[PDB]
């Protein structure tokens, strides 16, 4: 060989390896992180991302009166003046009135432990289970997986059960319990960085995904107020708004208002999510975090730091200022904070972009108030759902843009009314900001999920399960309502999702029917619990070995196995194998007898019924084995013993066929 | 200048760039971290 081609092949190997290494650098520095699941519980009756979308799209204000079931002396802790200990001038704020509600029995927690358990831990457990279920992952099957749990939380002072009271109130447990109840093995870290806590955690989660330390991660936050201390003490300096509405970027901005909530995201690398065939909702492209540093007091924002973190997040995402279509601004509603944030957004985003595509600025806090540590992650959920619906929801309580900042540039505009999101020439992109009181800023950039058959199996079983019969009925009713608002979904896809992507619990039920006219009524009958023809119900046994019974004479009828010969290929193959093994000492073909073709002997003759029954029974047993039901034993009955022997491995197919055929002939 | 020696320069550039990229990967994943400063206050009169 000439030296030219000899060195050319080496050059080809070298440049291919160089391309591989460069791609590895690209995916190790900044890989896109897929948000494969989300869950949230927010004020205003929100308990899912769809609920949050319904709230924001309708422009509903979730601010409401204080809770009365928490032992608060709500009548005796309101006075108008802004300077008094133990008193506040705020009437209303966001709340989770079902914060104490918790399904203790589901997670194996006794009632006494649950009473001495922080509400944050309970809410985080429920939200994490919901997020895993919404991601297409069975939460039970995640046991032993290298899944991280990064959670933003704070010590809110919630306080035979002496042991439970210790681990039931430590903030470090707030993430750890999630990885203990579910059995996860990735790192569990509880972040605490004030309002930036959750979003910061998400950034850390992305790093944990990029280094390979995790295959999946939970990034989220939780905020609960067991006591009104956040309202009485913080109101001394007129920090809260009088009416309790977080007027974001409005001239009437005269303070903020607190709110409870919880929001988690099950996040995985985009390549890994694509490999496993997971549904990608959005894609965190890049993130950045820094600190205000030197500023006019510890609790005061700095526009330069916000510009820096926005630019750093854009650079990490590899996206321009003009590439982002909208931003979920922090928007605390404070008089001093809002102009600073507006100036930062104008300097960073609205500097070089077309005049006809201004940056749309919104704020979830206008709807639900300042959700606290859980705010930032909750923000992206909004910016995910809008990104799914292509509609930017309006920000409430904006009589006009605030005059402190100058909107003369026109590059940044508030979402006074809903604006349709264009879906042309590029993926939809957005940003979320979670600027914190302690000074730690955080900015996240989201991008629209990238754009991504088999024949329908007949009579696909629809499986349902639950811990208790009431939970099973609730599951059936919820599935019926969900399917009602759906334009003719594929039944096989629903069957696969129910069978694979859901945990099998104790109390089980099934719906098997070949037509899509009885499934709805059957689901209803299960919901109210009345019986139905195609409905099956039962209680699974935790332990027990399986047995295959092989009865002898009696179980014969004309045309048996005729339909399986056409529909089922495995049954046809097994019948063909039995036919080949049986042809030696038999003067007819089994397939003709089963199909009932002309001239074949009927089942009245003794010498043919036992071979046919043996072959059908063996084929059915092997079909059961093909579906994963491997017997732990076998039992026969007269001639069926022969068939049982063939399944026991005692006799080969040829030997069993010989025995049954010659014994029947004798 | 013939191709047999012309391609050698490209191969040398390619392998140098490959070594640089591999060094970048190793630095990005497992670079050691130097402890340049230390401080502690612990029981028993410890202050350094």
């Amino acid at each position, epitope marked *: 060989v000439t030296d030219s081609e000899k*060195v050319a092949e080496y050059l080809r190997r070298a440049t291919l390896d160089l391309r591989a290494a460069r791609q590895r650098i690209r995916e190790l520095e900044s890989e896109p992180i897929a948000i494969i699941g989300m869950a949230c519980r927010l004020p205003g009756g929100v308990d899912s991302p769809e609920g949050l979308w319904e709230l924001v799209d309708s422009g509903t204000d979730a601010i409401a009166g204080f809770p009365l079931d928490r032992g608060w002396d709500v009548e005796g802790m309101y006075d108008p003046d802004a300077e008094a200990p133990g008193k506040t001038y705020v009437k209303e704020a966001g709340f989770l009135y079902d914060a104490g509600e918790f399904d203790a029995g589901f997670f194996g927690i006794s009632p006494r432990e649950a009473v001495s358990m922080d509400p944050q831990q309970r809410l985080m457990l429920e939200a994490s289970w919901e997020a895993f279920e919404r991601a297409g992952l069975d939460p039970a099957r995640q046991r032993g997986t290298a899944t991280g749990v990064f959670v933003g939380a704070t010590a809110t002072g919630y306080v035979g059960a002496e042991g439970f009271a210790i681990t039931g109130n430590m903030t470090a447990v707030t993430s750890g319990r999630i990885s203990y109840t579910l059995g996860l093995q990735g790192p569990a870290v509880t972040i605490d960085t004030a309002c930036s806590s959750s979003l910061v955690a998400l950034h850390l989660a992305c790093q944990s995904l990029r280094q390979g330390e995790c295959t999946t991660a939970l990034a989220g936050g939780v905020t609960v107020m067991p006591t009104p201390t956040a309202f009485t003490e913080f109101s001394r300096q007129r920090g809260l708004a009088p009416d309790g509405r977080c007027k974001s970027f409005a001239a009437a901005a005269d303070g903020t208002n607190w709110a409870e909530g919880v929001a988690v995201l099950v996040v995985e690398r985009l390549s890994d999510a694509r490999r496993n065939g997971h549904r990608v909702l959005a894609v965190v492209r890049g993130t950045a975090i820094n600190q205000d540093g030197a500023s006019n007091g510890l609790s005061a924002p700095n526009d330069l730091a916000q510009e820096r973190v926005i630019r750093s997040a854009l650079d990490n995402a590899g996206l321009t200022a003009s590439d982002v279509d909208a931003v979920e601004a922090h928007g605390t509603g404070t008089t001093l904070g809002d102009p600073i944030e507006a100036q930062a957004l104008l300097a960073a985003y609205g500097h070089e972009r077309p005049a006809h595509r201004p940056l749309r600025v919104g704020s979830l806090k206008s709807n639900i108030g300042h959700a606290g540590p859980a705010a930032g992650v909750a923000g992206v959920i909004k910016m995910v759902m809008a990104m799914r619906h292509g509609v930017l929801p309006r920000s409430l309580h904006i009589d006009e843009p605030t005059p402190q900042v100058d909107w003369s540039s026109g590059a940044v505009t508030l979402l006074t009314e809903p604006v349709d999101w264009p879906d042309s020439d590029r993926p939809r992109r957005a940003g979320v900001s979670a600027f914190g009181i302690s000074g730690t800023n955080a900015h996240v950039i989201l991008e629209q999920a990238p754009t991504q058959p088999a024949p329908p199996v007949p009579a696909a079983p629809w499986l349902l399960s639950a811990k208790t019969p009431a939970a099973l009925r609730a599951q059936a009713r919820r599935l019926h309502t969900h399917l009602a608002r759906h334009p003719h979904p594929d039944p096989t896809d629903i069957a696969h999702a129910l069978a694979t992507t859901r945990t099998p619990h104790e109390h089980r039920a099934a719906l098997v029917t070949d037509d899509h006219g009885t499934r709805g009524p059957a689901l209803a009958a299960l919901a109210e619990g009345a019986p139905d023809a195609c409905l099956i119900s039962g209680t699974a046994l935790s332990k027990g070995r399986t047995v295959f019974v092989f009865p002898g004479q009696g179980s014969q009828w004309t045309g048996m196995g005729r339909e399986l010969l056409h529909t089922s290929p495995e049954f046809a193959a097994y019948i063909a194998e039995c036919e080949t093994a049986l042809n030696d000492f038999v003067d007819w073909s089994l397939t003709d007898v089963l199909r009932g073709t002309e001239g074949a002997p009927g089942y009245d003759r003794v010498d043919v019924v036992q071979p046919a029954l043996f072959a059908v029974m063996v084929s059915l047993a092997r079909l059961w084995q093909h579906h994963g039901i491997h017997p732990d034993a076998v039992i026969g009955h007269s001639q069926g013993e022969i068939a049982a022997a063939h399944i026991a491995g005692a006799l080969s197919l040829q030997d069993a066929a010989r025995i049954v055929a010659l014994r029947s002939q004798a | 200048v013939t191709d047999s020696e012309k391609v050698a320069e490209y191969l040398r550039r390619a392998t140098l760039d*490959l070594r640089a990229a591999r060094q970048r990967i190793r630095e990005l994943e497992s670079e050691p971290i130097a402890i340049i400063g230390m401080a502690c206050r612990l029981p028993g009169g410890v202050d350094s």
Partner: antibody
Amino acid sequence: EVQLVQSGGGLVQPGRSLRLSCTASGFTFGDYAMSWVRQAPGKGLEWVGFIRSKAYGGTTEYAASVKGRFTISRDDSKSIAYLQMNSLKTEDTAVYYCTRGGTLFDYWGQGTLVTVSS
Amino acid sequence: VVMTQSPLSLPVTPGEPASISCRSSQSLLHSNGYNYLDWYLQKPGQSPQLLIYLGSNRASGVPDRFSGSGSGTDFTLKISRVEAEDVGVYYCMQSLQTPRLTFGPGTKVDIKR
């Protein structure tokens, strides 16, 4: 994702012809020069032959032990490499590997066991 | 004609460093400042794969344990971690002179005890 799949093995009596096919996917087949390398049972690898890319001319070279008896061709349209053996001898019993590269066997097929005996 | 030879066998325990040396009968350093030499691995029962090329450049997809070194007539393949997967036959195979009749006797590697 480079992949090479071999086929055409099986038993053959001595003094007869056989064909081994190597189908390649996941890369530009025309650019590379394909090669065949055999390994007898227990013994080390022995380079059978190779074929250049069509750009260089598509010519072939073979080892002395199989010169004339063996031939190599390549269909670039469907991206397959063919090894046509003629007049197999008892010494030709071996596992044959299809590899990418005339002098740098960076990628290898899964191998095909060709056994010849009367 | 050039000729390369290595140790016939080399026991290894999982964890220690290992080094398969081999020397040539001629200086393989080409005029273009390259060592026209390759290192291939054949695992037991699997097809051979390329470990190292041009003396020291490691191929993509190989674990970073392997590292080639040496020049002129002498060469070595050094391994940091040994595992049950790394057992097999290692061939150091020259490319300065062609055609290559055979890879060579190789270097059997087996678990140590």
